[PDB]
């Protein structure tokens, strides 16, 4: 409703770096709010795409940002009569970023890995990795829970059980209030998908440069399955956390599996031990139900509600015609320890191929009426297909069916304006939560400041 679309602020990165593919607000130990931005196609030292991260200070005019430096050199360690290899070329560092406390977690989901033993190998595969930093102190650490030292012959003599070679850890990420990092790995267990969890504090204290293979005893990975319904489901394509069991000591996970059960798509709510609480099945095949998931209390009853995006949902129209527009589903949590019912609200895109629902950012209470609100991205929506972001306000019965405000892309065609979103943080300290919108196609980020309601 009350986001200011006249006086925006633009941050920009190098050409062709996909600056703005991922973003997040960051608060240093003093409370100063900055913007962390991932640019997964940034050039590295070998003049080869490796990715990169930028830490943008808040300035009303914006401009260019200083880099958050990370080690981009390929590593090799000859230990235990084996040879360990890390390949950072085209790793896409910054394809996902998340901030917690005074720590920034940036992940390279396509970083490759291999282990050689005489004439055999483990296969050069994308296990992914995440790079952790503490900007003020300069501390650095890494976390790559899918690296292994098992030769390829063993996986074959074994029907490819517990195969974490293609995890792509860091594809999606999130941190709990306690400081427990949760990484989505859609390629884990031969593209079944898995989650990896470990406290941030232990990741730092157990990491040393050059080791490449180290143990994190407090880590927790999800489990493999023989169930063909999870095959090629990309479980962990999207991840979130929230409170869905009434117990405030436990933290529940929200996992998106957009191709679960033969591209039907699903979303699952779990506990900290990966025991499935609820499962929300897709509505239409290949709609990519579960591409994005969000958690926020929209009706103001204190219970987190669930929002699922299906960017490729085809809407039924006159004369048996289907039109791909995208759709978002709203699930209100019921009072007490009961199951989440049918969708409480269906939001459907308008522009053909607009992909309404690609991203869903909770905004907090934007208009300060008492109900949290959300923003939905259609990166190729709007009448010109240049991208569009729509704001929906929370009400006592859920969300409002029609948007309270529509932000048209200030960028040219192909910017993917809205592909990444983030709100619910007052960056200019005016008392209203603000929204930052990524547009990696234009290598830029736009900041929308919320102003008092007219």
């Amino acid at each position, epitope marked *: 409703l009350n986001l200011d679309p006249v006086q925006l602020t633009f941050y920009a990165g190098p050409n062709g770096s996909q600056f703005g593919f991922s973003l997040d607000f960051h608060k240093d130990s003093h409370g100063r709010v900055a913007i962390v931005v991932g640019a997964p196609r940034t050039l590295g030292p070998s003049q080869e795409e490796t990715g990169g991260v930028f830490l943008c200070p808040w300035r009303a005019e914006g401009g260019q940002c200083p880099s958050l430096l990370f080690d981009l050199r390929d590593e090799t360690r000859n230990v235990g009569s084996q040879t360990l290899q890390t390949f950072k070329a085209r790793q896409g560092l910054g394809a996902s970023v998340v901030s917690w406390s005074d720590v920034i977690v940036a992940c390279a989901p396509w970083q490759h890995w291999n282990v050689l033993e005489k004439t055999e190998e483990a296969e050069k595969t994308p296990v992914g990795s995440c790079f952790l930093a503490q900007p003020e102190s300069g501390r650095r650490a890494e976390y790559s829970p899918c690296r292994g*030292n098992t030769l390829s012959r063993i996986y074959v003599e074994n029907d490819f059980s517990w195969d974490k070679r293609y995890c792509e850890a860091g594809f999606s990420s999130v941190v709990t209030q306690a400081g427990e990092l949760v990484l989505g790995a859609p390629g884990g267990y031969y593209f079944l998908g898995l989650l990896a969890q470990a406290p941030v504090a232990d990741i730092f204290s157990s990491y040393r440069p050059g080791i490449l293979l180290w*143990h994190v005893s407090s880590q927790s990975l999800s489990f493999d399955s023989s169930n063909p319904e999870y095959f090629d489901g990309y479980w962990g394509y999207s991840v979130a956390v929230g409170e869905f069991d009434g117990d405030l000591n436990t933290t529940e996970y929200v996992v998106g599996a957009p191709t679960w059960s033969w591209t039907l798509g699903a979303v699952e709510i779990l506990d900290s031990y990966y025991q499935r609480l609820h499962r929300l099945r897709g509505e239409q095949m290949a709609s990519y139900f579960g591409h994005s998931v969000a958690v926020t209390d929209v009706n103001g009853d204190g219970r987190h509600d669930l929002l699922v995006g299906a960017p490729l949902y085809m809407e039924s129209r006159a004369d048996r015609k289907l039109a791909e527009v995208g759709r978002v589903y709203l699930f209100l949590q019921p009072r007490g320890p009961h199951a989440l019912g049918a969708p409480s609200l269906l939001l459907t895109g308008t522009q053909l191929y607009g992909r309404f629902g690609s991203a869903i950012a909770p905004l907090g209470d934007l208009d300060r009426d008492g109900y949290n609100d959300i923003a939905v991205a259609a990166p190729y929506g709007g009448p010109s297909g240049r991208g569009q972001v729509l704001v929906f306000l929370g009400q006592s019965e859920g969300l409002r069916s029609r948007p309270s405000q529509v932000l048209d892309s200030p960028f040219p065609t192909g910017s993917a304006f809205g592909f990444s979103l983030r709100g619910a943080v007052d960056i200019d300290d005016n008392g209203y939560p603000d929204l930052i919108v990524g547009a990696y196609g234009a290598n830029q980020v736009a900041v929308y400041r919320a102003q008092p309601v007219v």
Partner: antibody
Amino acid sequence: EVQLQQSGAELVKPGASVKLSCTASGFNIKDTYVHWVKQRPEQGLEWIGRIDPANGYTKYDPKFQGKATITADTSSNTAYLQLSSLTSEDTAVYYCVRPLYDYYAMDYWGQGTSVTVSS
Amino acid sequence: DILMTQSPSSMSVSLGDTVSITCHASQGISSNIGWLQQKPGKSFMGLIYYGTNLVDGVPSRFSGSGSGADYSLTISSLDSEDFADYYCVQYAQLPYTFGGGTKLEIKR
């Protein structure tokens, strides 16, 4: 706290077989590699072998092949070292070892088990 | 197999001294070395792993250094408990091999 609680001291006859144990306390034996080390006063420290208790695969020094047999049981959370066709040369102290962080390290050590072979 | 030549076999030193222990390998091992301590009549304790990194709980007066095939463990300001045996172990290749060991004795 990581503690490796090995079996009690063993006293056996030449040509018999003994089975040493290394029960884990404070963690799961399934976590890391588990090694076995032999210590003699004159000869010093010798590496026997390792085992991955998660899958059971083992590695040995060619010297101890046929004499040492390493196994593990995740149920009872214990790793074992069995010695066969014992000799006065097998009279030594035996330690089980696991790493702290580095996969290939030797950081945590049990208290050790003393073996004496005499008739 | 890789041979670990650890020198010297023993040294008689006093409290507060800064002593060093070399450990030479048959070939390069790219910092894949660890140092161990066995207090008299007790079991082993981890000091260093991967050449320079200290095991959790080990005082900072210990420090490992070196590269290639030559490595050194250094103790600054010797303490009463430091009088014990010290061994180097390499894990660059299987089988793992240990050094001859060094015994720290009190000088008088």
